[PDB]
Amino acid sequence: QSACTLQSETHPPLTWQKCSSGGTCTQQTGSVVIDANWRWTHATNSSTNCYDGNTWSSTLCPDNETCAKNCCLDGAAYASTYGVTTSGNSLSIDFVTQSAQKNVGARLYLMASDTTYQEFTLLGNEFSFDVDVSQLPCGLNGALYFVSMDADGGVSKYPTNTAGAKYGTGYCDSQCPRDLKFINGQANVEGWEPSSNNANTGIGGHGSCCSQMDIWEANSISEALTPHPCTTVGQEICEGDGCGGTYSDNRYGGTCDPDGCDWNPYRLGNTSFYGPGSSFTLDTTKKLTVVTQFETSGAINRYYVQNGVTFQQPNAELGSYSGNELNDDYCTAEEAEFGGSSFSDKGGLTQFKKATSGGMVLVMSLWDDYYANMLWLDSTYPTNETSSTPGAVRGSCSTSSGVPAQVESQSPNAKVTFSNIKFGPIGSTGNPSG
Numbered sequence: 001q002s003a004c005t006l007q008s009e010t011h012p013p014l015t016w017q018k019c020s021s022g023g024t025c026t027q028q029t030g031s032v033v034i035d036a037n038w039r040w041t042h043a044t045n046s047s048t049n050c051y052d053g054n055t056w057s058s059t060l061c062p063d064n065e066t067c068a069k070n071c072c073l074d075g076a077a078y079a080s081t082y083g084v085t086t087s088g089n090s091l092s093i094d095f096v097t098q099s100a101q102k103n104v105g106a107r108l109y110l111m112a113s114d115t116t117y118q119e120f121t122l123l124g125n126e127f128s129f130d131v132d133v134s135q136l137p138c139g140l141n142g143a144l145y146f147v148s149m150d151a152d153g154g155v156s157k158y159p160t161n162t163a164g165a166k167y168g169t170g171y172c173d174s175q176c177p178r179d180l181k182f183i184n185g186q187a188n189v190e191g192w193e194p195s196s197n198n199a200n201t202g203i204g205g206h207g208s209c210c211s212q213m214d215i216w217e218a219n220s221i222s223e224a225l226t227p228h229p230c231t232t233v234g235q236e237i238c239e240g241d242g243c244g245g246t247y248s249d250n251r252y253g254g255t256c257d258p259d260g261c262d263w264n265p266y267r268l269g270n271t272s273f274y275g276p277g278s279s280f281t282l283d284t285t286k287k288l289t290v291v292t293q294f295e296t297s298g299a300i301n302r303y304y305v306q307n308g309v310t311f312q313q314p315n316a317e318l319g320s321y322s323g324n325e326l327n328d329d330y331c332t333a334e335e336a337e338f339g340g341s342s343f344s345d346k347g348g349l350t351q352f353k354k355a356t357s358g359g360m361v362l363v364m365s366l367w368d369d370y371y372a373n374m375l376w377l378d379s380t381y382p383t384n385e386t387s388s389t390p391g392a393v394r395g396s397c398s399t400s401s402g403v404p405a406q407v408e409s410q411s412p413n414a415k416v417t418f419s420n421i422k423f424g425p426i427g428s429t430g431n432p433s434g
């Protein structure tokens with residue numbers, strides 16, 4: 001797609017800290033950009049929509065190439081349309097925003113310039129952020145994560161994409177998402193099927209795969225840390241059901257692991273660690289700090305800080321594994337005890353290290369789940385299982401929770417706030433900000 005300018009595009013500014021092994025930190029100034037799927041897509045020469053509701057224009061978009069030629073992405077009114085605001089080092093995303101139309105959530109990328117994404121090399125480094133999840137009930141997910149996207153949003157590889165990172169192009173993740181309207185400089189109208197339960201979305205014949213580090217998927221009830229490897233590290237198109245992921249009938253596709261080696265302290269047995277109020281170690285009614293460290297072995301370490309008190313990731317015992325480091329032994333014990341082979345099939349932490357060794361883009365989002373109601377995060381899943389099934393219970397939410405239309409109606413003013421991002425060598429991000 002190209003870019004149009006009927007609506008101006010001004011990326012909300014966002015600062016973050018780059019910290020040094022020598023003990024200082026230096027402020028960086030970036031901005032955030034909303035993903036292309038949230039934008040108005042219209043004809044290059046008029047205001048006629050190329051996509052509306054969950055249907056493509058059959059005349060403007062008779063095939064993927066003609067559609068991309070005929071159509072452009074336009075600018076975003078971040079606050080008034082999308083409920084996205086920033087202030088200094090803080091980013092807030094509202095759940096439902098009513099303007100001329102209803103918007104639900106957002107997916108945002110951290111930019112280096114107004115036309116390029118910021119890249120981070122995670123291996124050897126740590127990433128810290130503060131989060132307020134107090135206004136995230138059952139069924140919602142405020143996510144902070146990394147994906148192996150191109151810094152230019154795909155422009156250099158696919159010159160029929162001239163919109164680029166400035167307009168939030170080039171997304172990929174371990175779900176190999178097929179809901180994307182543009183992939184590799186072409187539309188995704190071919191094979192498009194509208195969602196039966198979402199007036200604004202559908203699933204196309206192509207998806208966009210790449211490695212994904214889910215630092216944080218969470219609400220006020222549950223949180224999870226999950227690396228996802230793919231057989232090809234970076235962005236790659238996939239065809240139909242070969243994509244696997246949420247958007248295919250068979251979740252286990254050809255290249256990415258859509259489940260990951262997940263670590264949810266509640267799921268692992270510690271039901272007192274994270275939740276609302278003073279009965280939990282971490283009180284989710286209050287802001288907390290989350291630090292994630294990528295040691296060069298390929299293992300992942302985690303600690304939290306709240307009100308000046310520090311907590312390592314809680315210990316877990318699972319099969320022959322015992323500890324709090326997310327390492328090969330944890331991931332293979334998890335597959336043995338909970339079931340499945342997707343993570344190991346796609347090459348495990350060894351394959352995942354190939355992604356963290358290179359650059360990845362920072363993503364922050366807020367979403368509800370039109371496929372499984374977020375039950376995998378915060379409830380019992382599958383819902384016919386009980387506490388006697390290892391790993392079935394992931395949080396205390398009812399198995400009836402998280403119906404999108406219901407939570408959108410009942411909790412439209414839900415929101416997530418991410419703030420105080422700090423990145424640098426392991427051991428550096430707790431030092432004084434600059």
Ligand SMILES: O=[N+]([O-])c1ccc(O[C@@H]2O[C@H](CO)[C@@H](O[C@@H]3O[C@H](CO)[C@@H](O)[C@H](O)[C@H]3O)[C@H](O)[C@H]2O)cc1
Nearest residue numbers: 214226246258259260262338339340376377381382
């Ligand atoms: O009996 N089993 O073997 C079994 C295992 C797992 C089952 O549910 C799957 O659980 C995964 C881990 O919670 C889920 O993966 C998560 O999916 C999210 C949505 O796509 C994604 O954002 C997250 O990163 C990922 O870890 C998966 O969705 C469940 O199907 C069921 C039975």
Ligand SMILES: O=[N+]([O-])c1ccc(O[C@@H]2O[C@H](CO)[C@@H](O[C@@H]3O[C@H](CO)[C@@H](O)[C@H](O)[C@H]3O)[C@H](O)[C@H]2O)cc1
Nearest residue numbers: 132134283285286287288289305306307308309310
């Ligand atoms: O030793 N510490 O590091 C430490 C940190 C935080 C502590 O308490 C928390 O302090 C927060 C900031 O003052 C409080 O949050 C603020 O509460 C206000 C009143 O409700 C509210 O208006 C504001 O928006 C909010 O940020 C929090 O309640 C405290 O628990 C203590 C020690």
Ligand SMILES: *[C@@H]1O[C@H](CO)[C@@H](O)[C@H](O)[C@H]1NC(C)=O
Nearest residue numbers: 270271272273281311314315
């Ligand atoms: C949960 O984790 C916290 C922090 O490590 C710990 O103090 C507490 O004892 C744990 N509780 C259970 C039931 O494992």
Ligand SMILES: [Co+2]
Nearest residue numbers: 205206238239
């Ligand atoms: Co094709």
Ligand SMILES: [Co+2]
Nearest residue numbers: 295297299325
């Ligand atoms: Co280690």
